[PDB]
Design a protein around this ligand. Sequence first.
Ligand SMILES: *C/C=C1/C(=C/c2[nH]c(/C=C3[NH+]=C(/C=C4\NC(=O)C(C=C)=C4C)C(C)=C\3CCC(=O)O)c(CCC(=O)O)c2C)NC(=O)[C@H]1C
Ligand SMILES: *C/C=C1/C(=C/c2[nH]c(/C=C3[NH+]=C(/C=C4\NC(=O)C(C=C)=C4C)C(C)=C\3CCC(=O)O)c(CCC(=O)O)c2C)NC(=O)[C@H]1C
Lengths: 315, 313
Amino acid sequence: DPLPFFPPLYLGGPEITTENCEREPIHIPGSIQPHGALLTADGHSGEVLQMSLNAATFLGQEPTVLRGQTLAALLPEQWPALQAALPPGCPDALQYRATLDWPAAGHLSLTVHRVGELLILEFEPTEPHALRNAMFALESAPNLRALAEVATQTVRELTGFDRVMLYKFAPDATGEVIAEARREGLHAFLGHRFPASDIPAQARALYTRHLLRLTADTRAAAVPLDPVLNPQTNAPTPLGGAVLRATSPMHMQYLRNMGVGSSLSVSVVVGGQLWGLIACHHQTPYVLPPDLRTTLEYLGRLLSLQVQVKEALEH
Amino acid sequence: PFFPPLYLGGPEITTENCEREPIHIPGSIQPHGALLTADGHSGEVLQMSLNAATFLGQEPTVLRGQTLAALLPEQWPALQAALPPGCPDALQYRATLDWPAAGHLSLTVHRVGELLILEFEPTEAPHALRNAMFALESAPNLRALAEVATQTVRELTGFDRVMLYKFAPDATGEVIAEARREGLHAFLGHRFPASDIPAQARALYTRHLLRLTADTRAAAVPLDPVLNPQTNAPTPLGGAVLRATSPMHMQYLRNMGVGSSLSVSVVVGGQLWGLIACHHQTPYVLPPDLRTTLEYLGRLLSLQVQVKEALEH
Ligand SMILES: *C/C=C1/C(=C/c2[nH]c(/C=C3[NH+]=C(/C=C4\NC(=O)C(C=C)=C4C)C(C)=C\3CCC(=O)O)c(CCC(=O)O)c2C)NC(=O)[C@H]1C
Ligand SMILES: *C/C=C1/C(=C/c2[nH]c(/C=C3[NH+]=C(/C=C4\NC(=O)C(C=C)=C4C)C(C)=C\3CCC(=O)O)c(CCC(=O)O)c2C)NC(=O)[C@H]1C
């Protein structure tokens, strides 16, 4: 039965059990994963409102100094570019990316998107023809099976992940591993099927709009935003569009129990519906840098197109 | 059918026989790169472009005996695996060579039956592609998508004119969006007859998705031999971007005052929906890595055109 979200934990909401999965408000956890930092800022003035508690250690500045400046002063070269790329009223799915040379922290990748009157800024550390070669190989795959196999093998070669799977949704939202590339010694998931509740309906809706999410370390504690609520609204900060957003504790426990230290999945979206997932596993924690993740994002789109094409060749 | 090419004493093309020019088998290439053909098994260099000596820095005869194994040691096994016998002519493999004579070359290979076609071009060596991808996806409708696409391509390439050229059901074309330098004629809103892009060109563009004329006044460079030794027949060059552009179309571009031309096919439901079409007033060799960006954009636009057309119908 579909039911509306509970309030999050920090607003006195209940703790989540197998009974009530589909009601955890997974988009507003009030916290991020510790391998990057996040700031929120007023979309018109550029006043800095919220920051992750670890921000001082990524950005090399005291909180009170950060919060006491506008983005115009903090990001003089990027602030006008942000404002042109992310105009008021734009969708929350639109992202702008730049690379910064920050004194204390080396090269940072900056990813920005806009939710209403809020700008959300994510900072992460950042670092030949493999993509072009893959694009052509995907297109020349003769059928859906060969496409799925080429796609899994390519992603594994690009990333070094212990397991890469193509997980396909059935009409009842149960899923099935239909191809996989895996490290020697791992047991096969190929052909296995999993109940529809393994990925509940508020996740599958979110995964139709925001096409890539990750858990870099399934044992890492989440880092709170400070303050936790958006001071504009005294309400929760929407983090559904932020890759740094903390993963649901229910899901991290599901993954630890499997022996997974690192998870990542790309949505494959066909005709406006979530067709399947490129799901990857690593046994140890593992951070895939932003520019490599971009390659996977591009492959997500290519695969969406090629899945349509291969399936049309099939009636 | 097709007329024989000129160099096999076929008729010269007119506007009476637009549909029958054998544009895939011109026997020549554009001079900003070099092309070798080679045997699929032996790696034996069978044809070369008369300009190969320039790019490769090799005494002419040296090449036309040697083997790819010898000539490209690191690459030759990769090719063997990447382009297995029986693969499609559409499948391409690329690498960057740090080659003694020329700082860096791009190498592009595909296979047509028993022949490997190798293309060499100068090359080199950020977020504009990722930023463009998200911009295309958040365009609210087909019109805005067209506008974003043309603007994005112009910004990435510096081309004087970028258009989105959409085919009607009878292959009548329409310029539905345009991004252009100040002080050019506007082709926005104009329609053109199907015969401007003739049927044998449209079919080839459905399979091979990017072509270009780097300089509309440059002479083609012959293949030597012109005929493939294997077959004593013309080498198919339609999957080669270095292929000499039809003189009929270079005359069409010169009369327009264009010095450089590129286009990318937008393919939807197995059919040619339209073209990203670019003009430059002067000669312009777009480097391979930037062309790759446009090739990606072509696929992304193909996806988004279907998405956007579905939310009208
Ligand atoms: C009480 C609710 C439960 C629950 C919740 C839940 N699940 C997700 C998202 C995912 N679940 C996945 C499950 C699988 N991983 C595999 O490898 C296989 C099969 C071999 C399955 C079935 C996957 C892949 C996801 C997607 C994300 C990822 O790649 O890790 C969420 C949302 C997490 C988030 O975005 O923060 C939630 C809340 N899962 C259950 O099993 C029940 C107990
Ligand atoms: C006797 C046949 C004629 C003919 C042949 C022909 N045309 C092409 C290819 C193209 N024609 C194009 C035409 C236009 N470009 C524009 O900007 C506009 C409108 C403002 C039009 C109508 C285009 C865009 C192409 C694609 C190639 C490109 O991007 O430049 C070919 C094929 C060329 C080749 O690949 O070798 C041929 C043989 N064109 C005529 O007009 C008639 C007289």
